[PDB]
Design an enzyme around this catalytic site. Structure first.
Site, PDB file in Angstrom:
ATOM      1  N   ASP A 182      36.254  -9.105  -2.642  1.00 40.43           N
ATOM      2  CA  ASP A 182      34.911  -9.204  -2.406  1.00 40.43           C
ATOM      3  C   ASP A 182      34.725 -10.663  -3.672  1.00 40.43           C
ATOM      4  O   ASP A 182      35.616 -11.232  -3.984  1.00 40.43           O
ATOM      5  CB  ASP A 182      34.551  -8.531  -3.448  1.00 40.43           C
ATOM      6  N   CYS A 216      30.167  -3.839   3.849  1.00 36.58           N
ATOM      7  CA  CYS A 216      31.487  -3.960   2.881  1.00 36.58           C
ATOM      8  C   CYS A 216      30.548  -2.990   1.924  1.00 36.58           C
ATOM      9  O   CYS A 216      30.852  -1.862   1.890  1.00 36.58           O
ATOM     10  CB  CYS A 216      31.804  -5.681   2.723  1.00 36.58           C
ATOM     11  N   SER A 217      30.851  -3.765   0.654  1.00 36.28           N
ATOM     12  CA  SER A 217      30.528  -2.887  -0.754  1.00 36.28           C
ATOM     13  C   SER A 217      28.820  -3.143  -0.900  1.00 36.28           C
ATOM     14  O   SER A 217      27.954  -2.276  -0.183  1.00 36.28           O
ATOM     15  CB  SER A 217      30.770  -3.024  -1.491  1.00 36.28           C
ATOM     16  N   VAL A 220      26.283  -8.053   2.567  1.00 40.27           N
ATOM     17  CA  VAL A 220      26.253  -8.919   2.443  1.00 40.27           C
ATOM     18  C   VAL A 220      26.943 -10.257   2.742  1.00 40.27           C
ATOM     19  O   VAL A 220      27.402 -11.001   3.359  1.00 40.27           O
ATOM     20  CB  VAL A 220      24.295  -9.590   1.191  1.00 40.27           C
ATOM     21  N   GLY A 221      28.040 -10.410   1.657  1.00 41.71           N
ATOM     22  CA  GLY A 221      29.280 -11.771   1.718  1.00 41.71           C
ATOM     23  C   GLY A 221      30.205 -11.592   2.833  1.00 41.71           C
ATOM     24  O   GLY A 221      29.775 -11.950   3.523  1.00 41.71           O
ATOM     25  N   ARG A 222      30.634 -10.263   2.542  1.00 42.81           N
ATOM     26  CA  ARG A 222      31.718 -10.450   3.804  1.00 42.81           C
ATOM     27  C   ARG A 222      31.674 -10.108   4.691  1.00 42.81           C
ATOM     28  O   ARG A 222      31.935 -10.083   6.476  1.00 42.81           O
ATOM     29  CB  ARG A 222      33.028  -9.430   3.571  1.00 42.81           C
TER      30      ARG A 222
END
Ligand code: VO4
Length: 281
Positions: A182, A216-217, A220-222
């Site tokens: 993350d 992901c969690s 947004v990012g990964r």
């Protein structure tokens, strides 16, 4: 303004320029993407009935692009995202909570999803990131009005592929990449390139499918980095130019924070650099 297409024969030098002077110009570019899409509201996600349905109170879908459940009982934290070839090519979502996993599977059923990509672990360094929202072994389980049963599981060093049968009223493949921290990046470009190419092969083999789900969690990012790489790899195979800025810009128009850290934006360039080196060679 929206798009920065780089000729493939110029990319290596473009990326050097971006990296010069401690990433001065790369940082400038990534900062510009910060403002994209920022005029849009997330009122629905903020409704009191919905509070318990968001894993992060500050990472919420835009009203304009959110995915709606059949019917506020229509709410899930998920957004439609365009890809290289159609406007609802992906649904990105947060990692399901124990109280929203039934909503997640309802979405998967209603949107005719055949492929789900998961780029977080369930728990990372003892911080919970995602509920284990599928069955643990081959024993079946209900999720709302649906029944799910795992038919197979293939564990590899960097990812695991599972297949489920879902009964409602279909087979679903789940691609679980287990080595992406993350807020960070995988250890190598090769690992994610190989993963993306693998999932795209399955997507290409999925006649009739609705959008591919990616999460992901916070989603947004990964998630955004995975989608951006999927889109740019297809650009490379079909086109004479590559547009990483333009891909991330289009993602940001549809959901907040897509490609969540500057290192992830660097990583997209390193993957493209590495592929082009292998090719024009
Ligand atoms: O769990 V993700 O922070 O990469 O949005």
């Amino acid at each position: 303004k929206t798009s920065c297409p780089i000729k493939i024969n110029q990319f290596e030098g473009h990326f050097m320029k971006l990296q010069a002077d401690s990433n001065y110009l790369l940082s400038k570019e990534y900062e510009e993407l910060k403002d994209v899409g920022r005029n849009q509201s997330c009122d629905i996600a903020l409704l009191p009935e919905n509070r318990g349905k968001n894993r992060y109170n500050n990472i919420l879908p835009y009203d304009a692009t959110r995915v709606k459940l059949s019917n506020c009982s229509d709410y899930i934290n998920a957004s439609y995202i365009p890809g290289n070839n159609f406007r609802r090519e992906y649904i990105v979502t947060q990692g399901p909570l124990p109280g929203t996993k039934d909503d997640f599977w309802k979405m998967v059923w209603e949107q005719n999803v055949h492929n789900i990509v998961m780029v977080t672990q369930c728990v990372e360094k003892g911080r919970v990131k995602c509920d284990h929202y599928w069955p643990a072994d081959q024993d079946s389980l209900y999720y709302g009005d649906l029944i799910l049963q795992m038919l197979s599981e293939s564990v590899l060093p960097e990812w695991t592929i599972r297949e489920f049968k879902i009964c409602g009223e279909r087979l679903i493949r789940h691609f679980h990449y287990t080595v992406w921290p993350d807020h960070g990046v995988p250890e190598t470009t090769q690992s994610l390139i190989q993963f993306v190419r693998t999932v795209r092969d399955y997507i290409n083999r999925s006649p009739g499918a609705g959008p591919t789900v990616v999460h992901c969690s916070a989603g947004v990012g990964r998630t955004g980095t995975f989608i951006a790489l999927d889109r740019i790899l297809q650009q490379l195979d079909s086109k004479d130019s590559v547009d990483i800025y333009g891909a991330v810009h289009d993602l940001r128009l549809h959901r907040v924070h897509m490609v969540q850290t500057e290192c992830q934006y660097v990583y997209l360039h390193q993957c493209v650099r590495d592929v082009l080196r292998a090719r024009k060679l």
